[PDB]
Amino acid sequence: LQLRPYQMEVAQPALEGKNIIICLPTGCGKTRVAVYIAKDHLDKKKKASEPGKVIVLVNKVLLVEQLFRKEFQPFLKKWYRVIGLSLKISFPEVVKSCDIIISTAQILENSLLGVQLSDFSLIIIDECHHTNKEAVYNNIMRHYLMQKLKNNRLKKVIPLPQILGLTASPGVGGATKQAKAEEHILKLCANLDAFTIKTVKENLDQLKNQIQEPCKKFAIADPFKEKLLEIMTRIQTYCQMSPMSDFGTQPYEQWAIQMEKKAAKEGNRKERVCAEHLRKYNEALQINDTIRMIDAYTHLETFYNEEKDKKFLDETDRFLMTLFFENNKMLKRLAENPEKLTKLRNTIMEQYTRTEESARGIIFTKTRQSAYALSQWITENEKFAAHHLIGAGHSSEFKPMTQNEQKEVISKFRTNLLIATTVAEEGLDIKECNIVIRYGLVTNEIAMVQARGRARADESTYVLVAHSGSGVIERETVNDFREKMMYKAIHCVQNMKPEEYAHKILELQMQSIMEKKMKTKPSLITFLCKNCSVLACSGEDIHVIEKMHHVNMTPEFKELYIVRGEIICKCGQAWGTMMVHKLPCLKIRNFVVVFKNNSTKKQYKKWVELPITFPNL
RNA sequence: AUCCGCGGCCCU
RNA sequence: AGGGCCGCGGAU
Ligand SMILES: Nc1ncnc2c1ncn2[C@@H]1O[C@H](COP(=O)(O)OP(=O)(O)NP(=O)(O)O)[C@@H](O)[C@H]1O
Numbered sequence: 274l275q276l277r278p279y280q281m282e283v284a285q286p287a288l289e290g291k292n293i294i295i296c297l298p299t300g301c302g303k304t305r306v307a308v309y310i311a312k313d314h315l316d317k318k319k320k321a322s323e324p325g326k327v328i329v330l331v332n333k334v335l336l337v338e339q340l341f342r343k344e345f346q347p348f349l350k351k352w353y354r355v356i357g358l359s360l361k362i363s364f365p366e367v368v369k370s371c372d373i374i375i376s377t378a379q380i381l382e383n384s385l386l387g388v389q390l391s392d393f394s395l396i397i398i399d400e401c402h403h404t405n406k407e408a409v410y411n412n413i414m415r416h417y418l419m420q421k422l423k424n425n426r427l428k429k430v431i432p433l434p435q436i437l438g439l440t441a442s443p444g445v446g447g448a449t450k451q452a453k454a455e456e457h458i459l460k461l462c463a464n465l466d467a468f469t470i471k472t473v474k475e476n477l478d479q480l481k482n483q484i485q486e487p488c489k490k491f492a493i494a495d496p497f498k499e500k501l502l503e504i505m506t507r508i509q510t511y512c513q514m515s516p517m518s519d520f521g522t523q524p525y526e527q528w529a530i531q532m533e534k535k536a537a538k539e540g541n542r543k544e545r546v547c548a549e550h551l552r553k554y555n556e557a558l559q560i561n562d563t564i565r566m567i568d569a570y571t572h573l574e575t576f577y578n579e580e581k582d583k584k585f586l587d588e589t590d591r592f593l594m595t596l597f598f599e600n601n602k603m604l605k606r607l608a609e610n611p612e613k614l615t616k617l618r619n620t621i622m623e624q625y626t627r628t629e630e631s632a633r634g635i636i637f638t639k640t641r642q643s644a645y646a647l648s649q650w651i652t653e654n655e656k657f658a659a660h661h662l663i664g665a666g667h668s669s670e671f672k673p674m675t676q677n678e679q680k681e682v683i684s685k686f687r688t689n690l691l692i693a694t695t696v697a698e699e700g701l702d703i704k705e706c707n708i709v710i711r712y713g714l715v716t717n718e719i720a721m722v723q724a725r726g727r728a729r730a731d732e733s734t735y736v737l738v739a740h741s742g743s744g745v746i747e748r749e750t751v752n753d754f755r756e757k758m759m760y761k762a763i764h765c766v767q768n769m770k771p772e773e774y775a776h777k778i779l780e781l782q783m784q785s786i787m788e789k790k791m792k793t794k795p796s797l798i799t800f801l802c803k804n805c806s807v808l809a810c811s812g813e814d815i816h817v818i819e820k821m822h823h824v825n826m827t828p829e830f831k832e833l834y835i836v837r838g839e840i841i842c843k844c845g846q847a848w849g850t851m852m853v854h855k856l857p858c859l860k861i862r863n864f865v866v867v868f869k870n871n872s873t874k875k876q877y878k879k880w881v882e883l884p885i886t887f888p889n890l
Numbered sequence: 891a892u893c894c895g896c897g898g899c900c901c902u
Numbered sequence: 903a904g905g906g907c908c909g910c911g912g913a914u
């Protein structure tokens with residue numbers, strides 16, 4: 274099944290032709306409306322004796338299972354055949370059978386380079402706002418439009434699907450003006466070839482009483498540090514390095530990176546190694562502002578404890594280790610004794626007293642370490658009388674959670690966990706949510722709306738914990754203004770005259786199509802260790818397996834490293850990782866490449882960037 | 891146990 | 903260009 278009255282008006286144009294976008298406020302239940310267009314569609318095709326299909330593209334693999342089980346499957350189980358997919362089955366073959374297909378976005382893209390658009394009848398799109406020139410989803414929409422222009426020439430026919438997009442909500446990317454904001458929304462319609470945004474107007478009251486917004490709240494605040502800065506300054510005079518920017522902040526952090534890069538090139542030890550150590554100290558200062566002082570210390574302890582094993586000694590590491598390990602006892606002492614220290618502690622407790630048990634809670638924080646550090650802060654410090662969730666991608670030297678392990682935490686939340694701490698935001702379902710605090714996190718107007726929509730119902734409160742300065746609050750205000758600005762922008766395009774709207778939308782389409790004219794895409798090098806200048810591998814000695822893993826099997830290389838699997842230099846600088854098949858792989862980042870033609874040392878972040886091709890194995 | 895490639899969003 | 907964060911795909 275059944276559609277609520279407000280959801281009927283938004284679905285009416287989609288029901289007959291008229292490819293549209295559907296944007297309804299968060300918590301509206303708008304994935305359900307998509308199911309109704311599908312039923313309407315397929316049933317209509319059987320009567321017309323024409324084929325039926327639906328591709329239902331999504332941004333998350335976890336949404337594939339979630340959408341299937343909750344929305345599309347249970348209603349359509351008897352009538353039509355539904356399949357979710359992200360297990361070693363051929364894609365053109367699933368398309369043969371199975372009236373409805375819920376797939377990860379890229380999975381289709383892969384097969385458009387076989388299966389074509391012409392086969393599919395209707396396309397359903399989760400979070401349309403990702404649609405842009407830059408990314409999935411998608412390039413696929415430009416394939417649809419490119420095919421469409423082909424039809425414009427024929428008239429002067431190949432069948433094209435109906436496109437039903439679903440987003441809350443398009444938003445204005447990075448544009449303060451009211452004029453430019455509209456330009457983004459015309460672009461979003463242009464890429465989706467949708468006729469109108471089709472918001473909810475006639476039934477607006479029905480909704481407002483059904484789904485309520487959280488009241489935005491505000492919390493603000495305004496020894497270890499001076500101890501630590503003292504250490505860094507002495508390290509600075511050791512190398513005769515003057516940054517000119519204050520310690521414990523980003524512009525200074527970026528200067529320390531750039532200094533290490535150039536130091537690898539000139540091959541001067543003490544200049545680079547210190548800078549790497551400085552990056553580590555600076556990290557402690559910047560986290561100490563936003564996180565418990567024990568974590569500031571722990572970040573440095575584990576760093577140094579790992580440096581003893583890597584090493585097992587030159588004058589530099591001795592100056593640094595001796596300097597830290599004498600002060601090690603001191604810092605741990607300062608860490609465990611209680612501005613920044615007290616932050617938000619009251620905030621959750623106020624929510625626990627009001628309602629019987631604060632059954633739901635959600636925190637948002639910038640960094641992965643902060644999620645784990647806060648959770649550990651909340652597990653301790655009972656009586657109250659909490660768990661963390663983080664992403665799957667691999668960077669920063671933290672370990673991603675398993676996708677199933679994430680699925681575990683939400684299912685445990687549906688019950689053992691009262692409060693979760695995440696940077697993931699949109700696309701995962703939580704109900705009965707109230708507090709939803711954002712801790713030091715800015716993001717953009719679209720992430721704000723998705724996150725805000727977490728907590729409903731009822732009486733929900735949306736809180737921002739901020740530093741006095743540099744404030745997040747100034748960036749948050751502008752986000753809100755833009756949230757409000759998108760609505761007026763979504764208004765302009767609906768009441769724009771059809772003759773104008775269609776004429777201009779084409780110029781956005783032909784422009785996006787004409788755009789891609791571009792091209793998509795060996796003994797000349799010698800690799801040196803970056804910490805220390807020693808020949809590691811000449812360029813012949815590297816090999817490639819399956820076009821991906823860059824490996825050195827040359828027995829000479831075996832001599833140069835130690836293990837523990839992780840590969841490390843004589844010096845102790847990490848070199849690579851040991852992958853086992855029945856092959857050692859090395860990260861480019863740990864080496865500095867010397868060009869032969871004239872000696873120039875360039876350093877690379879990843880393998881693809883360097884022009885030379887390597888021999889396959 | 892990771893690798894590899896691609897892409898978004900932030901901030902300087 | 904950096905760092906942080908998020909995600910998809912192809913590997914073993
Ligand atoms: N038309 C409907 N009639 C009855 N229940 C509905 C309807 N639509 C959604 N629901 C319920 O709402 C739940 C899912 O919708 P909801 O959690 O509010 O987010 P949603 O479908 O993701 N909307 P959105 O976040 O804006 O994409 C389901 O458990 C349904 O029980």
Ligand SMILES: [Zn+2]
Pocket residue numbers: 802803804805806807842843844845846
């Ligand atoms: Zn070395």
